[PDB]
């Protein structure tokens, strides 16, 4: 026939009132339902607001910036934010705890995963869980950087 | 029981009607089929926990943290039945250019403790409210049973 999320909601609210499951479960199911309507667009941090690291910055300046912002992962850029070279994970810096003089950012930089703004959060979540990924870079329909999106932001 | 099955097949029907996609269906099914789960069911058991000893040197701590590659670690005193707090790996960066100043306890956060028989559903809720990611699971006498993470229950 034909249906809406509304019909599913009624169906579930019904089961709860018939005590098939409890209030907390009901809230969890409705949250999943609401989540299914969302896209990367809805959870991303926009380009002009991302905290990034410059390709050629010193270990001292990188480390201070990482501590200051307290993030765990950072896009690393070349000329500007439309040239993302990779992702640095804050804790990969600890490899240089005792030999900072040997710091080589390219030695610890990981490749960036790219996604479009229209991608469903359910697909993104599945891919984050599979790839053991935590951050993706969001690309606009022309190849430019639209922003970034994180696992911790979407599981909120 | 007949209540649960029924809710399920109507969820599948809503899927075949384009209400939501297969990925969502999976999430919904999981939240149901597994709504009776407890912390006990998702925990990393005591022997498999990767922990830090309170008095280990910055060298030993740092190598272990890099090797196991977790982002969070219980910190213990005498043994695993004495958890003193949780260390976030990135907080070690505080000592990058002054490793001689290392004081593990200055970067140690309070541990949260939960019972084995707590529902995952309730735990999930408390993790989200508390902006918490790890809990230490304890038995009926306060002994450590294991640890449990947001990652593992979602
Ligand atoms: N490298 C980054 N640049 C801009 N915002 C971030 C970055 N990493 C995490 N965030 C956001 O800040 C919060 C805490 O890090 C996260 O929930 C996320 O929304
Ligand atoms: N301190 C720790 N000791 C043992 N396993 C952990 C620790 N922190 C996260 N994990 C588990 O390692 C896996 C990868 O993060 C997850 O299943 C997570 O639960």
d(CA A5, CA A13): 12
Q: Residue A24: how many CB atoms within 10 A of its CB? A: 15
Element (H, E) at B62: helix B58-68
User: Among positive and negative, which fits the CA dihedral A59, A61, A67, A70?
Assistant: negative
Task: Mark the binding-site residues of A for adenosine, compressed into ranges.
Answer: 51, 71, 73, 152-153
Q: DSSP of A70-95, one letter per residue?
A: --SEEEEESSSTT-EEEEEEGGGGGG
CB A35, CB A121: distance < 8 Å: yes
User: Which stretches of chain B sit within 8 Å of chain A by CB?
Assistant: 3-4, 7, 10-11, 13-14, 17, 19-21, 23-24, 27-28, 31-32, 35, 58-59, 62, 65-66, 69, 71, 89-90, 92-97, 99, 119, 121-122, 124-125, 128, 150, 154
| Residue of chain A whose Cα is closest to the Cα of B130 | A156
Structural domains in chain B?
1-47+113-154 (3.10.580.10), 48-112 (3.90.1280.20)
The length of chain B, given as a count of residues: 154
Pair A70, A152: CB distance under 8 Å: no
Q: How many whole angstroms from A32 Cα to the centroid of ligand 1? A: 23
Instruction: Tell me the resolution in Å.
Output: 2.0
Residue of A12, A17, A94 to mutate, testing the B interface (most B Cβ within 10 Å of its Cβ): A94
Residue A71: CA count within 13 A, CB half-sphere: 23
For residue A134, give the 3-state DSSP assignment.
Answer: coil
Minimum-distance ligand to the CA of A48? 1
Tokens 């201070």 correspond to what residue? A64
The residues, any chain, with a CB within 8 Å of residue B86's CB and separated by 6 or more, are B72, B73, B74, B75, B108, B109, B110, B111, B134
Please name the residue whose Cα sits nearest to atom 7 of ligand 1: A71
**Closest atom of ligand 2 relative to the B74 alpha carbon:** 1
Please tell me the distance from the alpha carbon of residue A50 to that of residue A46, in angstroms, as a whole number.
7
CB A67 within 8 A of CB A53: no
Contact A156 B4 (CB under 8 A): no
CB contact under 8 A, A94 and B99: no
3-class state of residue A125 by DSSP = helix
Which experiment gave this structure?
X-ray
The upper half-sphere exposure of residue B74, i.e. CA atoms within 13 Å in the direction of its Cβ, equals 30
SS3 B123: helix
Rounded to an integer, what distance in angstroms lies between the CA atom of residue B105 and that of residue B101?
A: 12
**Where do runs of H (alpha helix) occur along chain A?**
5-17, 23-35, 59-69, 105-108, 121-131, 151-154
- Chains A–B, number of C-beta pairs less than 8 Å apart: 111
Integer angstrom CA distances of residue A71 from A52, A91, B44, B53: 10, 10, 26, 26
Q: Phi and psi for B87 in degrees, rounded to 5?
A: -110, 130
Q: Whose CA is nearest to atom 17 of ligand 1?
A: A153
Closest CA to B148 of B107, B109, B116: B116
CB B116 within 8 A of CB B145: yes
Which residues face A110 on adjacent strands? A87
A93 vs B contacts (CB less than 8 Å): 93, 96
CB of B25 closer than 6 angstroms to any ligand 2 atom: no
Q: In whole angstroms, what is the distance from residue A81 CA to residue A144 CA?
A: 9
Distance CA B33, CA A72 (A): 34
């Amino acid at each position: 026939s034909n249906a809406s999320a509304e019909d599913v909601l009624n169906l579930l609210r019904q089961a709860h009132e018939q005590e098939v499951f409890d209030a907390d479960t009901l809230l969890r199911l409705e949250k999943v339902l609401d989540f299914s309507d969302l896209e990367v667009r809805d959870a991303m941090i926009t380009r002009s607001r991302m905290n990034v690291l410059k390709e050629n910055d010193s270990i001292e300046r990188i480390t201070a910036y990482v501590i200051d912002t307290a993030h765990s992962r950072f896009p690393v850029i070349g000329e500007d934010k439309d040239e993302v070279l990779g992702i640095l994970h804050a804790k990969d810096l600890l490899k240089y705890m005792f030999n900072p003089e040997q710091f080589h950012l390219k030695s610890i930089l990981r490749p960036a995963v790219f996604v479009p703004e229209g991608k469903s959060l359910t697909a993104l979540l599945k891919e984050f869980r599979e790839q053991r990924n935590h951050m993706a870079i969001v690309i606009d329909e022309y190849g430019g950087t639209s922003g970034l999106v994180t696992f911790e932001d979407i599981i909120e």
